[PDB]
C-alpha cells in the first residue's frame, strides 16, 4: 500500500551532523597556529608575514564553516 | 516574587571576624599577575591599570570561601547558576569595556581590523573586524559557562561516586567475612584510591578555574593597555 | 694600514647554487675529506659517502640537499663510481653537505680503518672500565665512559668487517 | 534526577507574592508626594529623571501595534507552549 | 495516505551530534599549545610574543565551538 | 492523520553522543603533555615555565569537555 | 493524538557511545609514553622529571575518561 | 497512551559501540612501540629503562581498554 | 571497526621501524624484535574485538 | 570501513619507507623485505574484516 | 567511507615522497617505483569496497 | 563522507609539496609534476565515490 508519512523532527539530526563538520575547521584551525608558532621561533625575523599567511588560512577555513552552519540553520528552520 | 533565603558562609564569616581582628601579612595569591602588569623597567601607563587589584581579590576570597569549601560534603555553593554567573561576569567585563569606550579615543579600536593593507579591506579585513568583535563577547560568555560548568560536572561526578561507594560498602561488606572477601578489597581499595584521586583533582581544578577567570578578566584590559616609556 | 683576510689567500672557495635555478642531474658527489688542516681527500668524485651524525646514519649521494651534520665517533664510509670502497674512522667533527654536489666532511681526525688495532682496542677498554669503577668524581666518570664510547665504536666497527 | 536535586539552595525561610500592579501604583504614589511639593519646579532635573522615561516607555507601549499576540505576562500557567492564554 | 508523525525526543539525539564537534576545537586548542611548548623551548627570548599567538589562535579556535554550543541550546530548549 | 509521539528513552542517545566530545579533549591533552616532554629535553632550563604553560591549555582544552558533559547531565536529567 | 512511547534498550546504545569516549582517551596516553621515549632518548639524565610530567598527564587524561565512565555505567543502570 | 516497548536486538548495538573503543587503544599502543624504535636508535645505551617505561605505557592504555570490554561483555550476555 | 585502529597501528610500528633500521642499521634484530612485541599486543587486541564479532554473528 | 585502518595503515608504511630509502639508500634491499612484512600483516587483518562483510552478505 | 582512509594513504605515501625526492632527487626513480607500488596496493583494498557496494546497490 | 579523506589526502601532498620546495628548492617542476599525479588519482577515488552517491541518489 502507497503510505506517506511526514516526520517533524528529522531536521534536528541533520543539523546536529552539519554542525559537526565544524570538528575539521575546529582543528585545522589548530594545526594553522601551531605551525605558526614553530615558524616564528625558527625565523622570528618574518613575523607579520605568517601572521598575514595565518590570517588567511583561518578566514577560509572560517568560510567552511559558515557554509556548514547556513546548512544547519536552514535546516533547523525549514 | 521575593524569596528570602541566606548564603551557607556565616560560619566562615565568624572565622574571618574571628582570626582577622588583627592584621596578617599575605604572601600567596592565587591571581599574581594582577600586581605586575609591567615586566620591562621604564615602561608605564597613564591609565589605571591596577583597578582591578581589590575586586580580584575580593572574587577570589568569595570564590574560595565557596567552591573550596564545597567539597565537604552536604556544603552547598549558593551561587551556582548560569544567569547569576551570567550576571556576575557581565559587570566586571562590560564595566572595563565601557571605561575603555568612555574614553572616546576611538584609536585605540585600529588594532580590531586585523591584517595589513595587502588584504582586500572588504572582503578580509572587514570579516576579521567582525569576528573577533563578536570574541569579545563569545570571551566573555566562554568565561562563565567554564567557571559554571566545572563546578556543575566536577559535584555530579563526586556525588555519583559517593553513592557507589555508599552501596558497596554498606551491602557487600559482608563478604570480607565470605570467601570472596579477595574481590571485596580489591574493589575498596580501588574505591579509596579514586576517592582520593577525585578529592585531589577538584581541588586543584576550583583554583586552576578561578585562575583562568580573572586571567581573562586581566587579558581583556591588558588588550587596550598602551604603555609609553621614560625618558 | 688595512691587514689582509687569512681566507684572501685561499683560491677554492665554496659554490653556492642559486636557489631559482635550473637543477641538474649529477652522479658524481666532489668529496672533501679533511684531518687537522690536511686534505685526505680534495674534490675527489665519489659516488657515495655514508657518514654517522648525532642523530644517525646519513647515505649522501650527488644532489643531497643542504645539511650540516655533527659526526660522532664512528667509521666513514667512501665509495667510488667503480664501485671500490676506502673506509676511514673519525672521532669527530662536522660534515658541510651542499645542493651543488659537494661534501666537505672535516674531522679532528680521519683514520683508515686498517690501522687501528682490535687487540689495542680491547685492552684499553678493560682499563678504561677499572677507572671508570674507581673513577673519583662524576667528572673524571664522564671523561672515562666518552673514551669507553669511542674505543666501543671502534671495536663494533672492526668486527663489522 | 535525585543528583541534580542537590544542586539548590538550601536556607530558604521566606517567600512573598506581590502584583506588578500594585507595588507599580505604590511606586507612583510615592513618587508624585515626592514630586509634588511646589519647592520643586517641573524644569528640574530630578523631576524630569523621575517622569520624563517613564513617560517615555509607556508612550512606546501605547504606541505599540504589533501583528502577533503577546500573552499576558502573569497568567495563572505559562508553561503550556500550545495555550498562550 | 497522509500521516503526520512528531517525534519528541529526537532533539536530543540533534544536541548530543552537535556537541561532538567540541572534540575538533579540543583536539585543535591541544595541538596550538603543543607547538607552542615546543617552540619556546627553541626561541625562548620570544616565548611572551608566542604567547599573545597562541591565545588568538584559542580565541579564534573556541568561538567555532560556540556556534555548535548554540545550535544545542537552542534545539535542547525547543 | 495528525500523531503525536513523545519517546522518552532517546535522552540516553544524545548523552552518550556527547560523551565523544570528549575523546578529542582526552586527545588533546595527551598532546600537551607530548609535548611538553619532548620540550624539555630540549631546554630542561625552562621546564617550570613551559609546565606553567601546559596547565594553562590543559584547562582550556578541559573547559571544552565540560561543556559537552554539561548537555550529557542536561539530557540525562530531563 | 497523544502517544507515549518508553523504549527499554535504549540505553545499551547510549552506553555503548560513552565508551568510545575511552578511544581518544586511550591514545592520548599511549602519545605521552611515546613522546616521553624520545625526550629521554634525546636527554637521558631527565629520567624522572619527565616520568612525574608522563604521570601527570595520564591522571588527568585518566580523569577524562573516568568522568566518560560514570556516565557509561550510569545509563547501563538506568 | 503509555506503551512500553522492550527490543530484545539492541543489546547487541551497544555491545558493538564499545568495542570501538580498542581501536583507540590498539592504535595507542602502536604509537608507544612507534616512538620505541626510534629512541633505542637514538639511544641504543638506554635499551632496557625505555622498554620498561613502553610497558608501563602499554598496560595503562591496554587498562582503558578492558574497562571499555567490560561494558561490552556485560551488555552481551544481559 | 575497531580492527581500522589495530591495523593502522602495526603500519605505525612498521613504519617508524624502517627510520629506525635506516638511522641505526646495526640494530637490526633488537628493533625487529620489538615491532614483532608490538604487533602482537596490538593483535590481541584486534582478536578481542574480533571474538565478540563472532560471539554477536552465530548469537 | 575496518578496510579504511588498513588501507592508510599501508600507505604510512610505505610513507616511512621513502624516507627511510631517502636517508640510507644502500639499505633498500633489507628495508623493502621489512616494508612487505608489514604489508603481510595489515592486509591479514583486512581479511578478517572481509570475511565478516562476505559472511554477513551471503547469510 | 573506506575509501576516505585509501585516499588519505594515497596522499601520504606521495607526501613522504615529495620529502624523499627533495633529499635525495638521484633515486627519484627508485622512490617514484615504490610510491606506484604502495598506491597499487592502496587501492587494491578500494576494489574490495567498491565490489561490496556494486554488490550490494545492485542487490 | 568519502570525500573527507580525499580533501585531507590532497592537503597532506600540498603540505608535503610546500617542505620539499623548501628543502630543496631548485626540484620544485619534478615535485609539481609527482603532486599533480598524487592528485589525480586521489581525486580518482573521490570520483568513484561520487559516482554511487548519484547512482544511489538516482535510485
Ligand atoms: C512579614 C514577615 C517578616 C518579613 C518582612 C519582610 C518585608 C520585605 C519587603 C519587600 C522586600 C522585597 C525584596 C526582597 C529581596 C530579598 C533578597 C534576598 O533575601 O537575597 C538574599 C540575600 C542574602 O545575603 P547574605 O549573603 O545571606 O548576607 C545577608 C545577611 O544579612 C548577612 O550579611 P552581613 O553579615 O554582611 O550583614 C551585616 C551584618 C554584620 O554582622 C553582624 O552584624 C552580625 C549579626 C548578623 C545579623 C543578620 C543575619 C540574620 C540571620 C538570620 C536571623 C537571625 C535571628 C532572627 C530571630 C528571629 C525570631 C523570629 O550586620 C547586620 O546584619 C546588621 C544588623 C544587626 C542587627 C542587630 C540587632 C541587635 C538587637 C539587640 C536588642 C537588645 C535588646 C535588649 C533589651 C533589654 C530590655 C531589658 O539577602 C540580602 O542580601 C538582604 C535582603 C534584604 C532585603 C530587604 C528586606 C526588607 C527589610 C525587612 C526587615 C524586616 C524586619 C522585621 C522582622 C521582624 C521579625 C519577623
Ligand atoms: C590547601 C589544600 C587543603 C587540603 C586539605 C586536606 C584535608 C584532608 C582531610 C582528611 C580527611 C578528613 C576527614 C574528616 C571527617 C569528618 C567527619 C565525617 O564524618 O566527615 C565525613 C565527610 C564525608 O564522608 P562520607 O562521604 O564518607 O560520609 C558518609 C556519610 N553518609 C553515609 C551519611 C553519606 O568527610 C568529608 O567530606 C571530608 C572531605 C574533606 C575534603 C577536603 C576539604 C578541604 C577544603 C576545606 C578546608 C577548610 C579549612 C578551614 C580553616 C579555617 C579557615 C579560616
Same mark, same amino acid.
Given at each position: ?78 | ?55 580580584? +581579590? ?134 579509596? +584510591? ?5 578529592? +585531589? ?31 | ?161 | ?7 539548590? &539552595? ?26 509634588? &511639593?511646589?519647592?520643586? &519646579?517641573?524644569?528640574? &532635573? ?40
Amino acid at each position: 500500500s502507497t503510505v506517506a508519512i511526514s516526520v517533524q523532527g528529522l531536521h534536528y539530526v541533520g543539523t546536529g551532523l552539519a554542525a559537526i563538520a565544524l570538528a575539521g575547521v575546529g582543528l585545522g584551525i589548530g594545526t594553522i597556529f601551531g605551525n605558526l608558532l614553530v615558524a616564528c621561533a625558527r625565523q622570528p625575523n618574518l613575523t607579520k608575514m605568517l601572521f598575514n599567511y595565518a590570517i588567511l588560512g583561518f578566514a577560509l577555513t572560517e568560510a567552511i564553516g559558515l557554509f556548514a552552519l547556513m546548512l544547519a540553520f536552514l535546516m533547523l528552520f525549514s | 516574587m521575593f524569596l528570602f533565603f541566606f548564603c551557607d558562609l556565616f560560619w566562615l564569616r565568624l572565622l574571618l571576624c574571628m582570626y582577622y581582628c588583627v592584621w596578617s601579612r599575605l604572601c600567596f595569591i592565587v591571581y599574581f599577575n594582577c600586581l605586575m602588569l609591567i615586566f620591562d623597567f621604564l615602561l608605564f601607563c597613564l591609565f589605571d591599570l591596577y583597578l582591578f587589584v581589590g575586586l580580584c +581579590l575580593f572574587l577570589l576570597l568569595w570564590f574560595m570561601l565557596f567552591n573550596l569549601y564545597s567539597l565537604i560534603l552536604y556544603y552547598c555553593i549558593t551561587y551556582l547558576n548560569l544567569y547569576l554567573l551570567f550576571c556576575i561576569v557581565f559587570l566586571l567585563y562590560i564595566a572595563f569595556l565601557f571605561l575603555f569606550c568612555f574614553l572616546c579615543d576611538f584609536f585605540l579600536f585600529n588594532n580590531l581590523l586585523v591584517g595589513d593593507s595587502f588584504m582586500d579591506v572588504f572582503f578580509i579585513r572587514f570579516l576579521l573586524c567582525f569576528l573577533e568583535c563578536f570574541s569579545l563577547l563569545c570571551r566573555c560568555l566562554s568565561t562563565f559557562l567554564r567557571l559554571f560548568c566545572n563546578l556543575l560536572s566536577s559535584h555530579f561526578l563526586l556525588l555519583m561516586f559517593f553513592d557507589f561507594f555508599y552501596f558497596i560498602f554498606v551491602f557487600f561488606f559482608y563478604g570480607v567475612f565470605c570467601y570472596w572477601f579477595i574481590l571485596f578489597i580489591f574493589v575498596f581499595c580501588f574505591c579509596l +584510591l579514586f576517592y582520593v584521586f577525585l578529592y +585531589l583533582l577538584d581541588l586543584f581544578a576550583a583554583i586552576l578555574q578561578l585562575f583562568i577567570f580573572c586571567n581573562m578578566i586581566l587579558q581583556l584590559i591588558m588588550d587596550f593597555l598602551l604603555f609609553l616609556l621614560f625618558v | 694600514h688595512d691587514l689582509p683576510e687569512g681566507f684572501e689567500f685561499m683560491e677554492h672557495k665554496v659554490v653556492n647554487k642559486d636557489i631559482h635555478a635550473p637543477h641538474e642531474n649529477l652522479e658524481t658527489l666532489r668529496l672533501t675529506l679533511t684531518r687537522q688542516d690536511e686534505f685526505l681527500l680534495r674534490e675527489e668524485p665519489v659516488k657515495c659517502v655514508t657518514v654517522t651524525g648525532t642523530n644517525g646514519e646519513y647515505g649522501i649521494y650527488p644532489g643531497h640537499a643542504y645539511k650540516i651534520v655533527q659526526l660522532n665517533p664512528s667509521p666513514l664510509t667512501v665509495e667510488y663510481t667503480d664501485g671500490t670502497t676506502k673506509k676511514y674512522f673519525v672521532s669527530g667533527g662536522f660534515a658541510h653537505i651542499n645542493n651543488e654536489g659537494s661534501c666537505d666532511v672535516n674531522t679532528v681526525e680521519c683514520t683508515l680503518l686498517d690501522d687501528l688495532d682490535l687487540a689495542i682496542a680491547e685492552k684499553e677498554l678493560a682499563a678504561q672500565q677499572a677507572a671508570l669503577g674507581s673513577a673519583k668524581d662524576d667528572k673524571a666518570k664522564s671523561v672515562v665512559e666518552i673514551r669507553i664510547s669511542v674505543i666501543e665504536a671502534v671495536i663494533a666497527a672492526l668486527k663489522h668487517h | 534526577s535525585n543528583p541534580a536535586d542537590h544542586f539548590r &539552595p538550601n536556607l530558604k525561610a521566606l517567600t512573598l507574592y506581590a502584583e506588578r500592579q500594585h507595588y507599580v501604583d505604590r511606586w507612583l504614589h510615592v513618587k508624585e508626594r515626592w514630586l509634588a &511639593p511646589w519647592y520643586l &519646579p517641573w524644569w528640574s &532635573p530630578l523631576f524630569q529623571l523621575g517622569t520624563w522615561y517613564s513617560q517615555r516607555s509607556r508612550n512606546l507601549f501605547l504606541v505599540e501595534n504589533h501583528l502577533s499576540y503577546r500573552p499576558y505576562k502573569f497568567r495563572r500557567n505559562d508553561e503550556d507552549r500550545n495555550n498562550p492564554y
